[PDB]
Coordinates of N, CA, C and O in Angstrom, one line a residue:
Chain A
X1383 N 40.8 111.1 11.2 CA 40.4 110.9 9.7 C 41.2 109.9 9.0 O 42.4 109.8 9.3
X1384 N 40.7 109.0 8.2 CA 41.7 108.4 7.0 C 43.1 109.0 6.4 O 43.4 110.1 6.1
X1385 N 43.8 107.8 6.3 CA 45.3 108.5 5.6 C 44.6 108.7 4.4 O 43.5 108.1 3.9
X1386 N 45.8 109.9 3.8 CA 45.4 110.5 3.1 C 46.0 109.4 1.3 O 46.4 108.2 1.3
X1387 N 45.7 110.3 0.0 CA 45.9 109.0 -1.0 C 47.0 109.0 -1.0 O 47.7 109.6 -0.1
X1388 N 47.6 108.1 -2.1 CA 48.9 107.7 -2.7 C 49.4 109.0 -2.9 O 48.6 109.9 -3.1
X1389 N 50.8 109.2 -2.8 CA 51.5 110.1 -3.2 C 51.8 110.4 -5.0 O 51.6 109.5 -5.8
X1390 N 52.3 111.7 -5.4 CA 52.6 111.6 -6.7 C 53.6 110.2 -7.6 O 54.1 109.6 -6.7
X1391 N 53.8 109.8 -8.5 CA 54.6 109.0 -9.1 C 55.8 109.8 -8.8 O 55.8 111.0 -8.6
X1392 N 57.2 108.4 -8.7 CA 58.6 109.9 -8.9 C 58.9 109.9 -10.1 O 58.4 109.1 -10.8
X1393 N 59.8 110.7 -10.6 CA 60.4 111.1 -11.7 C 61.3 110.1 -12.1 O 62.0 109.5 -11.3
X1394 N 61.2 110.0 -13.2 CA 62.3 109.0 -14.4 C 63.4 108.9 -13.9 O 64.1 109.9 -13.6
X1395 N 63.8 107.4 -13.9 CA 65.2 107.3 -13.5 C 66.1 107.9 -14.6 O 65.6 108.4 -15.6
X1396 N 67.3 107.9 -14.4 CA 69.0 108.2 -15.2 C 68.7 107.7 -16.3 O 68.0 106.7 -16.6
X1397 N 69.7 108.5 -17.0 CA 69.9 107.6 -18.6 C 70.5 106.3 -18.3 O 71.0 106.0 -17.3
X1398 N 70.2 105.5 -19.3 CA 71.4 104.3 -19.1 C 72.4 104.6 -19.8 O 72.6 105.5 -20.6
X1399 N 73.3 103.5 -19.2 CA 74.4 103.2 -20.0 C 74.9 103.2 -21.4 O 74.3 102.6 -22.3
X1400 N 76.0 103.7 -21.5 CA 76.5 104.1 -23.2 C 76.0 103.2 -23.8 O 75.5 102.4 -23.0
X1401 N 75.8 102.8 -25.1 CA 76.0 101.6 -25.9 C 77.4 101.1 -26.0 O 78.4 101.6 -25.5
X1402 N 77.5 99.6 -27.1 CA 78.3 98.9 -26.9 C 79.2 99.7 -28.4 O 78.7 100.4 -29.2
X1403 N 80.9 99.1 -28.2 CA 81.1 100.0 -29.0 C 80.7 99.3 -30.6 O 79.8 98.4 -30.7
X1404 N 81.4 99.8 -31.5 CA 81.0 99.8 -32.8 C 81.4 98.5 -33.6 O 81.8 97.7 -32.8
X1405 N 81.3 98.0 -34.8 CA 81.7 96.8 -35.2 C 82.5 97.2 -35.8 O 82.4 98.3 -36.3
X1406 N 83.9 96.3 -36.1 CA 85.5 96.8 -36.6 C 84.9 97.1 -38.2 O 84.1 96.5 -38.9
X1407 N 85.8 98.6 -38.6 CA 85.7 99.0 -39.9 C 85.7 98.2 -41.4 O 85.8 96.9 -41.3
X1408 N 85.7 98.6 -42.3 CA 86.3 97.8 -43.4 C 87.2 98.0 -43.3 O 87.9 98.8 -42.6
X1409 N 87.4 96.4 -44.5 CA 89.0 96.3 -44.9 C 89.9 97.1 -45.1 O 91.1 96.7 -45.3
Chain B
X589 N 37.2 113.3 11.8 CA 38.5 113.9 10.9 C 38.5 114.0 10.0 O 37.8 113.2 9.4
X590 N 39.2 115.2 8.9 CA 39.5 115.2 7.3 C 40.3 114.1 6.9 O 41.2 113.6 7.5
X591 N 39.9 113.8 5.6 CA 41.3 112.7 5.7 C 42.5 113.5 5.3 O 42.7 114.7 5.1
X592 N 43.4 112.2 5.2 CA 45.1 113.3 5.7 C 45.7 113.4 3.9 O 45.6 112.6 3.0
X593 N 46.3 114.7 4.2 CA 47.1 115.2 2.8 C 47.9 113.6 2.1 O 48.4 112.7 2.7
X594 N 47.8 114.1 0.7 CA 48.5 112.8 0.6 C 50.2 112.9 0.6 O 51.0 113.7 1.1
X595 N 50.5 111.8 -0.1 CA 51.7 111.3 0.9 C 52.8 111.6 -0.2 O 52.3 111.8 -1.3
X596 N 54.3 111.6 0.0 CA 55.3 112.4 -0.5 C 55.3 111.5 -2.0 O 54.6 110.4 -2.2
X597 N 56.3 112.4 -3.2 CA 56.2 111.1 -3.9 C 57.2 109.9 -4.2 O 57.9 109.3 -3.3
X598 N 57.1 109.7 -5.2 CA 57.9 108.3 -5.1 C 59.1 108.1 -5.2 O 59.8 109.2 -5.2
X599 N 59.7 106.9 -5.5 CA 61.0 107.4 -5.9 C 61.2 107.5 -7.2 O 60.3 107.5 -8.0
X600 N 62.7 107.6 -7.6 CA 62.8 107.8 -9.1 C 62.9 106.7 -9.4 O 63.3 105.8 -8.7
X601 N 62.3 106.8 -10.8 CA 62.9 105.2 -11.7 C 63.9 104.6 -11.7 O 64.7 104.9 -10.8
X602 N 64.2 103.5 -12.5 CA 65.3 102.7 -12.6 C 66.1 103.6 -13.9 O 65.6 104.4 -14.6
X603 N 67.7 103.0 -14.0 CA 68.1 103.7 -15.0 C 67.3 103.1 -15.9 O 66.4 102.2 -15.6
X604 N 67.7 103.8 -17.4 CA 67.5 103.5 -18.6 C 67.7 102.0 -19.1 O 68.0 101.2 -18.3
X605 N 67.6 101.6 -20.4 CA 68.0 100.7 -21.5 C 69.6 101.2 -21.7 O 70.2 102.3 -21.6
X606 N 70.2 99.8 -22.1 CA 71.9 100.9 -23.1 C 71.4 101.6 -24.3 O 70.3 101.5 -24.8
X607 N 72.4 102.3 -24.5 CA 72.4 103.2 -25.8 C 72.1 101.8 -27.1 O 71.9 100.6 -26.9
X608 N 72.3 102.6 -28.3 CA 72.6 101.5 -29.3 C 73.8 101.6 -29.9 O 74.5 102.7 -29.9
X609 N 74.1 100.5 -30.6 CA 75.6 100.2 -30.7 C 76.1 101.3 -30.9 O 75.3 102.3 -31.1
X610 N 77.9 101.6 -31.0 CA 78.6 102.5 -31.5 C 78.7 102.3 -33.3 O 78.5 101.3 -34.1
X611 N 78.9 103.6 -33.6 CA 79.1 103.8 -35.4 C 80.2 102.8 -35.8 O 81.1 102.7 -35.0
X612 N 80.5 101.9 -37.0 CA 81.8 101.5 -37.7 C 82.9 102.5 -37.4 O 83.0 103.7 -37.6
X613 N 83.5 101.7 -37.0 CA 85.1 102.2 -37.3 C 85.1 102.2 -38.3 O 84.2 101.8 -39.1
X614 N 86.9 103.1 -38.7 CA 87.2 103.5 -40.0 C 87.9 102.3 -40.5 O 88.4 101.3 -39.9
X615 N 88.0 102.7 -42.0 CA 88.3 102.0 -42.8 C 89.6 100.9 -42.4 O 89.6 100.1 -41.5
X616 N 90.7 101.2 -43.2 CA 91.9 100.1 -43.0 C 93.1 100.8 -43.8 O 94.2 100.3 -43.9
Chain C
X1059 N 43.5 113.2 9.5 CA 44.4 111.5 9.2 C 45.7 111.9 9.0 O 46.1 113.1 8.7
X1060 N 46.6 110.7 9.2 CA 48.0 110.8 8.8 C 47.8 110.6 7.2 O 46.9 110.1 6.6
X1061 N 49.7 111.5 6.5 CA 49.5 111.4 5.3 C 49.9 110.1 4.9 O 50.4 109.2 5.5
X1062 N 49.3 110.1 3.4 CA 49.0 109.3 2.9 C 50.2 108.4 2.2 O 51.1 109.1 1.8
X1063 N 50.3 106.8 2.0 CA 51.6 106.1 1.7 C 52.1 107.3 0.4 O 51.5 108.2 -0.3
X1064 N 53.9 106.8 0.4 CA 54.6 106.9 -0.8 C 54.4 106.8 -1.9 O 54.1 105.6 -2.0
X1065 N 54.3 107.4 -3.1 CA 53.5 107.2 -4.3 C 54.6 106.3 -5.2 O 55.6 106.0 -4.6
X1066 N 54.5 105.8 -6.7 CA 55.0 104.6 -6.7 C 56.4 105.0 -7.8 O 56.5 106.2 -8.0
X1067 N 57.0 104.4 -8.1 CA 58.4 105.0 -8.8 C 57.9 105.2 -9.9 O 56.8 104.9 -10.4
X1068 N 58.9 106.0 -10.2 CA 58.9 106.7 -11.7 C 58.8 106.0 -12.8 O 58.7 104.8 -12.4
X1069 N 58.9 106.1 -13.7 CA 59.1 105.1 -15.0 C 60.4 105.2 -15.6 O 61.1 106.1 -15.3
X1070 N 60.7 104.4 -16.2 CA 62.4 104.3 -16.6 C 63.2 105.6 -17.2 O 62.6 106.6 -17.5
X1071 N 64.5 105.4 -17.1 CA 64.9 106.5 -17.5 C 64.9 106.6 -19.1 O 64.2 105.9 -19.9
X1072 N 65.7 107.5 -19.3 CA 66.3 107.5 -21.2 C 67.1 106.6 -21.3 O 67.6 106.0 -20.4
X1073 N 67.2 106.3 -23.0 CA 68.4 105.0 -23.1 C 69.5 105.7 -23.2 O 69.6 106.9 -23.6
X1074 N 70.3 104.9 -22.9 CA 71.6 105.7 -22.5 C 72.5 106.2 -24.0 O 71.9 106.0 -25.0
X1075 N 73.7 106.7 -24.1 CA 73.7 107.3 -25.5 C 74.3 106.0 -26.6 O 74.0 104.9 -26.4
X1076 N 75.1 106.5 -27.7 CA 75.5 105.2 -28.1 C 76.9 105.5 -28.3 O 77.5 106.6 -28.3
X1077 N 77.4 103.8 -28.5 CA 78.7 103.5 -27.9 C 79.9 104.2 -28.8 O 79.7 104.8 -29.9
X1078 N 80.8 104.1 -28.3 CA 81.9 105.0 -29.5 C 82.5 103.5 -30.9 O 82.7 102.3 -30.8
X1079 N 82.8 104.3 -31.6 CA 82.7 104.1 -32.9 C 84.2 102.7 -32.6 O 85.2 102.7 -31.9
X1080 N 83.5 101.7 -33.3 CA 84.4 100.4 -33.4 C 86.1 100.5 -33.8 O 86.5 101.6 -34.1
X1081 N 86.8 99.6 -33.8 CA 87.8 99.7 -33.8 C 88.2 99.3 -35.7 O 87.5 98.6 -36.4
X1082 N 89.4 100.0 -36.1 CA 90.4 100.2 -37.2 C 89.4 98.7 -38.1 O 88.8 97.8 -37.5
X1083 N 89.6 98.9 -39.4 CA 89.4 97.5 -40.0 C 90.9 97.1 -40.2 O 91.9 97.6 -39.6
X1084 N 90.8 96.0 -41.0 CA 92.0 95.2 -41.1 C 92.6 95.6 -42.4 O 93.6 95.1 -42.8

Protein backbone atom coordinates (compact mmCIF):
# COMPACT_ATOMS: atom_id res chain seq x y z
CA UNK A 1 0.00 0.00 0.00
CA UNK A 2 1.04 3.74 -0.18
CA UNK A 3 2.99 5.55 2.73
CA UNK A 4 0.95 6.77 4.83
CA UNK A 5 0.28 11.05 5.18
CA UNK A 6 2.39 13.62 6.74
CA UNK A 7 2.84 13.39 10.28
CA UNK A 8 1.22 15.81 12.98
CA UNK A 9 3.02 19.48 13.12
CA UNK A 10 5.60 19.48 16.33
CA UNK A 11 5.04 21.61 19.16
CA UNK A 12 6.33 25.33 19.67
CA UNK A 13 9.76 25.84 20.19
CA UNK A 14 11.19 27.47 23.80
CA UNK A 15 10.75 30.84 24.91
CA UNK A 16 13.36 33.10 23.73
CA UNK A 17 15.71 34.93 25.26
CA UNK A 18 15.37 37.52 28.03
CA UNK A 19 15.12 41.01 26.66
CA UNK A 20 17.79 43.58 26.65
CA UNK A 21 18.35 45.25 29.84
CA UNK A 22 16.72 48.66 30.62
CA UNK A 23 17.69 52.28 29.60
CA UNK A 24 19.88 54.11 32.57
CA UNK A 25 17.41 55.92 35.11
CA UNK A 26 16.87 59.60 35.57
CA UNK A 27 19.08 62.03 36.72
CA UNK B 1 -2.44 -2.78 0.52
CA UNK B 2 -3.96 -0.15 2.98
CA UNK B 3 -2.06 2.70 2.91
CA UNK B 4 0.35 3.11 5.85
CA UNK B 5 -0.42 5.01 9.29
CA UNK B 6 0.81 8.27 9.14
CA UNK B 7 4.09 9.26 10.16
CA UNK B 8 5.58 10.58 13.69
CA UNK B 9 5.39 14.22 14.32
CA UNK B 10 7.57 16.87 13.77
CA UNK B 11 9.95 18.49 15.44
CA UNK B 12 9.67 21.37 17.74
CA UNK B 13 9.96 24.95 16.73
CA UNK B 14 12.63 27.25 16.80
CA UNK B 15 13.07 29.33 20.08
CA UNK B 16 11.16 32.39 20.45
CA UNK B 17 11.77 36.31 19.61
CA UNK B 18 13.74 38.31 22.73
CA UNK B 19 11.67 39.48 25.40
CA UNK B 20 11.19 43.38 25.26
CA UNK B 21 13.42 45.73 26.78
CA UNK B 22 14.11 45.80 30.54
CA UNK B 23 12.00 48.58 32.81
CA UNK B 24 14.20 52.09 33.67
CA UNK B 25 16.42 51.98 36.28
CA UNK B 26 16.08 54.02 39.22
CA UNK B 27 16.44 57.34 39.65
CA UNK B 28 19.95 59.00 40.85
CA UNK C 1 2.31 0.84 3.23
CA UNK C 2 5.13 2.14 5.21
CA UNK C 3 4.45 5.06 7.55
CA UNK C 4 4.13 8.08 6.39
CA UNK C 5 7.13 11.11 6.24
CA UNK C 6 7.79 13.32 9.48
CA UNK C 7 5.29 16.04 9.83
CA UNK C 8 6.73 19.57 9.75
CA UNK C 9 8.06 21.77 12.77
CA UNK C 10 6.22 23.52 15.08
CA UNK C 11 5.78 27.20 14.95
CA UNK C 12 7.91 29.51 17.04
CA UNK C 13 8.20 29.57 20.50
CA UNK C 14 7.05 32.48 23.06
CA UNK C 15 9.07 35.69 23.22
CA UNK C 16 11.22 35.38 25.71
CA UNK C 17 10.63 37.57 29.06
CA UNK C 18 11.92 41.05 29.45
CA UNK C 19 15.21 42.25 30.30
CA UNK C 20 16.05 43.41 33.92
CA UNK C 21 15.62 46.90 34.81
CA UNK C 22 18.56 49.38 33.49
CA UNK C 23 21.28 50.65 35.36
CA UNK C 24 21.36 53.73 38.32
CA UNK C 25 20.81 57.32 36.60
CA UNK C 26 23.46 59.85 36.95
Amino acid sequence: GPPGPPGPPGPPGPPGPPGPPGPPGPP
